[PDB]
Amino acid sequence: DVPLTPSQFAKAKSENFDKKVILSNLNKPHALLWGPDNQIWLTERATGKILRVNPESGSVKTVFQVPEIVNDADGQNGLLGFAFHPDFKNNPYIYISGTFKNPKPNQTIIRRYTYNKSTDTLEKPVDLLAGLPSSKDHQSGRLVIGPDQKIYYTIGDQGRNQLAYLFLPNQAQHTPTQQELNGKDYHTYMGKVLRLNLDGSIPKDNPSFNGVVSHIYTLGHRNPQGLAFTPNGKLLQSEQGPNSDDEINLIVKGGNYGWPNVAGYKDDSGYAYANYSAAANKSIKDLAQNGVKVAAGVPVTKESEWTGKNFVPPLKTLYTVQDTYNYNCWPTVAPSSAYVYKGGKKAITGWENTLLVPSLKRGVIFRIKLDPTYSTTYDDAVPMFKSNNRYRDVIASPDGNVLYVLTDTAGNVQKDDGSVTNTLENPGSLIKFTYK
Amino acid sequence: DVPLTPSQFAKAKSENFDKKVILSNLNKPHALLWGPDNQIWLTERATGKILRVNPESGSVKTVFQVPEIVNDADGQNGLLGFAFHPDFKNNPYIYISGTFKNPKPNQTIIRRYTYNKSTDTLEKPVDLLAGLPSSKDHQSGRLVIGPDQKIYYTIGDQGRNQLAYLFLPNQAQHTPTQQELNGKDYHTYMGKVLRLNLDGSIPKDNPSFNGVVSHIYTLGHRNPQGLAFTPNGKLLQSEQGPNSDDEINLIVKGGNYGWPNVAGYKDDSGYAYANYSAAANKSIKDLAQNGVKVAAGVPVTKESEWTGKNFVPPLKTLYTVQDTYNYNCWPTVAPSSAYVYKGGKKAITGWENTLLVPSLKRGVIFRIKLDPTYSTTYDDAVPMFKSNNRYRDVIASPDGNVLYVLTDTAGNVQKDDGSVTNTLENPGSLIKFT
C-alpha cells in the first residue's frame, strides 16, 4: 500500500468512541489478554510482572512476577510471550516467553506456569523450550495457542543487519541441521514462526526445511510482533519491516516470508538486501537508505536476485515505496501486534472480519478488513484513534463494543503535523475505547 | 513481480520435454479441454467449430460448428466460452459463449447445447443469458462450471479506455440497478466474473453490489482470460493488464479487482487511471504511457486516490514496475488462460499445486507454484517452452506428463533476442510436450 499523509493520519480521531485511561505509567506494558476471569491481564516486559486489572475500577493486582527476567533499558528484551491455555477451566496454564540469563549473555525461554486459583498466583514453572536466541532487538515473542492445540511463537531476527547488530549475519533464512537439533542448538531460530507441541517438543507434522523438521513453522521474518488466529483457523500476522514494507501476512505452513532478501513484495522497489556481515570491513557505515543506496564495500542483492524457495508475499504492506523515495519519517507504521476482531453481542458495525493492528510510530490502530473467508484483505489499512501515543497492543471485550489498548511508556511518535515527539499523551497506559 | 529479461525468457526452452505437433491446420484455436470421453476438445474462435482430437493418434473430427458466430478479423470476438457439464454421462450438455448479432451490432450469448452421442453432434440450443456486451476487444469469455454447479463466466471490459474504444467509459466498476436487471439490461456486465445458475438465472446466494444481487460475482476486471478451480474449490484467475500488471487473482465472492482505477497492486507504481471518457476534448490522444505520462485534458486518478470498496489485490503481477519505467517490450506477458495442474501418476516432479499460465506475447507457459491449500503463490512465475508462438491455452493429460497447448494462428511474439516477430513457429496448432 501507499503511505498515508500526515493529514490523513491526523484526521483519524475516532469520535465514535469514548476514551477512558484506566492506568498510566505502567513499566513497559506489552501484551494484554481478556482473562479467564473476565479481567484484563497484562504484562510488563521490563519487570516480568503479570498484572490483573479490573477495567471498571482500574484496581490492579500483581498476580505474579516472573523471576529473573532480564531486560535492558535500551532493549526490547524482557517478558514477551503471554497466553492462556484455550480451555483454561480444565487446563489452568499460562504460557510465557522471556529473556533470561544463559548459563551456557541471554537466552529466550518459552515456559508454562500453572495458575492456582486458590492462592491467586502462578507456580510449577516448566521450561518448554530453552536456549532460544536472545538480543536487545527484534525479539518479537508473540505466543498463541492454535486450534490445533500447538504453541505458535514468533521469534524475531534479533536485529541482525541493523544498528548494534549490523555486522552479524541475519539468520532469518537459516534452518537447523539435524546435528544442531540434536544438540538443542537453536541459533537458526531467528526470524521465524515456531510451532511447538504444548510440552515444547517438535510436532512430527511440522514442515520440513532443508531436509529437517524442527520447531520452525515459517521462516524469513524480521520482527513479527503480531500473530492471531482467525475464526476459520487461518493465521494472520503483522511484522515490522525496515525503512519500508511493514507487513500483514497470512502464515502458511512451511512458507518463507523472504526477509532479509525480500522486504514486502518481491518487487525491487524501495529496498535491496545489503548484507553488512559480508561487507569488506566493519568500519563501513549503514547509509540507512534501505539498501537502495549503500556505502562502498557492502554486497547488495536485489529482491529479484534472491534464489528463494517457498517465498510468500505479504497480504498488505505498510508501506511500499519506489526507489526514488527520500528516506532522508520512513514509510512504515511499526505494527506492534495483530488482533482478530471477533465481534460479539455488541459487535461494532462494519467491523466483521477485521484485523486490528496497533501502530507504534503513527499513534493509530489500523483496522484492516478481510473477506469473510479471511483469504484476502479488502481495501486499505484504516487508521483509528490518532493520538501522540505508541500503541503496543489491542484486544476487544467479548461483547465486542470495547477495545482495550496498551501504550508504550516511552519512545517517539508522529504528531498530527508529521513531526516527531517523545512526549507521549498516555505513557505506559491501559486505555479503553468504548463504541458510542 | 519484476519483469524477466529477454535472455531469461530466451533460456526458458524447457529442455526436458519432447515437443510434437498434433494438429497444425487450426484456425484461431481458442479453448481446449480434456473431455469426458478422454478426447481433447478444442474450439476455433472465428469459425465456431468444435473439434475433438484423439490425444494418442491425433485423429480429429469436427463435432459441430456453432452457427452465426460473428468474428472480426481484427478482433477477439467469436466463439469463446466452452465447458462440459461436470456430470456429462447423465447431463450431456456443453456450455458455450459466443458473439452473435444483436437484433436489438453484436451481443454475447451464453448458450447450452445437448450432445447427441449417436450422431455425434450438438443440438437443442438454449440461450441461458443473452444481450451480454460484445466488442472486438477484451471479451475474455472463459466459462467454467464450479463445484457448486454454477456457471462462472469472465466478461472483459470490452476494451473501453484504450485504442478503438478509448472514449467509452469503462464499466468494470459499474453494476446494474434493480430496474436494469429487471429489464435484462446487462450493459454493466463488463469487466466481471459472472456466476449464473445452469439455466442462466441469478443464483440466490450471489453477492450484492451497490444493493443489487445480479449475475455479477466479482467486478473490476480488465481482460480476465484465465479461470480455473483448484481441487479444494478455490477459483484462480489470470487477467491481462494494460502496459503492466497482468495479474494472477484469487476470485473471492463479492470482490472488487480494481480495474480500471487500479492495475495490479494499489501501489501508485507504473500506472495511473487516465479516464479518456471524461476528457472534454475528444481529439485528445492517448500517449500510451500507462497513465504515468498523459496529454493535457484527461483526468488522471492515482490508484491511491480511488475510493474503492472490497478491493482485492492480485496474488501476483506480471509485471509491476516503477514510475521511472520507460514504456517506449512492455512489462506484461499477456496471459491467455489459467490451468490448475492436477498431476497424476506421471506427475512432473516439482509441479505440485502449480497454476499454468500461457503467455501470448512471450511465447512461454509460466508455471506458478502455490502452497498446497492454494492460498498463496510460492516464488515466481517460471517460464517454460520458449518459442516464437503465441500460447493460447494449456491443459495436461490425466497422468500429468503430457501438456497440450494451443497456439494462435497469427500475431506478434517476442523472440529470444527480445525483438518482435509475427512469424509464428507453429501457427494455429495443437502441440504436445511430453
Ligand SMILES: [Ca+2]
Ligand atoms: Ca522499521
Ligand SMILES: [Ca+2]
Ligand atoms: Ca516478508
Ligand SMILES: [Ca+2]
Ligand atoms: Ca520489496
Ligand SMILES: [Ca+2]
Ligand atoms: Ca496488456
Ligand SMILES: [Ca+2]
Ligand atoms: Ca486487478
Ligand SMILES: [Ca+2]
Ligand atoms: Ca498498481
Ligand SMILES: [Pt+2]
Ligand atoms: Pt474507522
Ligand SMILES: [Pt+2]
Ligand atoms: Pt523449467
